[PDB]
Design a binder for this molecule. Sequence first.
Ligand SMILES: [Cl-]
Ligand SMILES: [Cl-]
Lengths: 386, 386
Amino acid sequence: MIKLCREVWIEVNLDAVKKNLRAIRRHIPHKSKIMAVVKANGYGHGSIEVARHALEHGASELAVASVEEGIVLRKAGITAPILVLGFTSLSCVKKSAAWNITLSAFQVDWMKEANEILEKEASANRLAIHINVDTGMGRLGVRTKEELLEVVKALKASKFLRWTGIFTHFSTADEPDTTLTKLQHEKFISFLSFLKKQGIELPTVHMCNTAAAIAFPEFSADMIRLGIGLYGLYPSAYIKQLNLVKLEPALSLKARIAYVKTMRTEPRTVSYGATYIAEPNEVIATLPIGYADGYSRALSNRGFVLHRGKRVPVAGRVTMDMIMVSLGENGEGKQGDEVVIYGKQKGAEISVDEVAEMLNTINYEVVSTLSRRIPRFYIRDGEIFK
Amino acid sequence: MIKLCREVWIEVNLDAVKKNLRAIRRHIPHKSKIMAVVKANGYGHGSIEVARHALEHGASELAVASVEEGIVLRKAGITAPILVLGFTSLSCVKKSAAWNITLSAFQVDWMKEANEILEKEASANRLAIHINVDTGMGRLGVRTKEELLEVVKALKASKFLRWTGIFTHFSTADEPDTTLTKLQHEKFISFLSFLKKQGIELPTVHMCNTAAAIAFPEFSADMIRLGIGLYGLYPSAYIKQLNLVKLEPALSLKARIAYVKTMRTEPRTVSYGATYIAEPNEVIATLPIGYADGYSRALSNRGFVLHRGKRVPVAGRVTMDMIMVSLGENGEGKQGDEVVIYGKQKGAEISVDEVAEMLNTINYEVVSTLSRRIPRFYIRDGEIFK
Ligand SMILES: [Cl-]
Ligand SMILES: [Cl-]
């Protein structure tokens, strides 16, 4: 089946991914395209297999966080457009042009220098650019009518750059008060009809995320950027309760019990600090997962795992590579039983939203901090591979 | 200097690992050897280059968490003995013997079947084994003197195995109260005099971690296991106060500013949730690090970084790949300045132990969860190389 030295692993279900994409294609306008976002190692799911699969079932472009995340995808064989969403240093202009990665930019002075660099180095390829406008997120991008017009001018004079898009980003589209999201929208559509009254023609316009596409599908324009909804999770509990789109979660996490024993011999202290003392006939089972894997130390004396269809609790402090759980008085368990940490087993479930509520964070962070020393296995059409 | 597309990195100082080993060699009995623990990517510092340095300046053997972590070491040329501290499935018994890796064991059936596997293949390699004795931590190991003699007898009746050590683990050796450390020792020692009064010769014996080698060096026996002290960090505030040994921290985390602007136009909101609203002459700067890199979301509106030798605060919510900081009304700075996240700058310092207190955990978790998409650079004799 699954043969490992240290027995812990992840399963990603690609039949779920393809379903999530169908649901979204069917909600937004027929005219708009889809940009699959696979940065941070596919939100901790694996970037190569998910993008391969998303391009064959509805998406047409991809988005990452850095030039290095994009080069990984070109090396796997992918030929689609790749856009970089953060800031790229001028010292990577020649390399971005060589691998044909699309860059974000928003300053007059960055534009001219990236043009002279490619002018001296012979030429070869032209570097493609998307312009970022800041309408209220306050992170990256240009902020006035007058400033934007200067950038479009410096870009149109540049013979080695090529203009293929313009976008914005909503900071509160997952919240039930829609005031600030409509603010950003008017600011944006106004900036670009100013451009029009100058006789300037526009490329691809994108602005929606998962929450915007579900909640305001009339903002879809040319393209949307689908991220968290690709992996089967909702942006907020608010957006889930709307009940407009049904998604299925793709990831789960599993291990195998490594040792079982009865605590009838003194002393009966468990794990560091001796914060837990067992009873003479309690059964303690040891498991191969720790906080260096991403299972938070905050969960000691507090969390659950699923064994044989039931929740059993964590006993003592979490350690770097191992946790102990209590099977109770006279137990019932054997070396090699399968244990579910996130996901489903028989009747029961422990979901990623539940763990994130317990730790006062969001599902976004619970998945994308799963270590890479854990091996990932993919399910497609019922069968397993890697 | 450094040249990166996304501008964030780690520096590890090997001159400082060297001084740490010296300091520990001085304080323990000159008869005992040192085994260096590099499991979990070398507590987040990188396993390869730290192991090489250690083996060159005082260590004799290594410890890791699993057979996979040991194969990355042999692939870079390291020929020293390597012990696996966790449980290894019978699946990998033949693999362990080919790469010459040492495994822990404490069961009679596991020895029988491990010996069988290598018999049925002839096999010219004998697999080395260390026996784990549980005297008080109840994680793994054997518990009574009766059943440790069956395991000793079985291992001996095994022509394809080889005994090369016997060990235990102190569960509270970094606390003011010494009651339990005294007792585990008493038990472990009487299990050994029990054995010796049987005709049996004993191999290498070890029981000490960083904490117990500082406070109880009369426990050093044949060998110690140096883990956290190697990277320059104290197991507890109580062990540090005893002021018996001097340590120097080995790791820093830095980045470069990607954009800067004055918040003149409206709206002046910053980041997701609009939880921070700027002033019209306030300066706001953007950094390339986030919670998928390992910088906890819990530091939203609460953490600091060092710019030009001063503490600036995080502004608004932490996001997946970027943070935002405030420089004040008319603050000075430009695109490209250097900032320190963990470490020292001009006169100031933000220490790993301070960040750990903010989040109610320990320095072990902070360092060993820094992601692998962040590059590490090494400093030896005051200069650079990756
Ligand atoms: Cl942005
Ligand atoms: Cl142990």
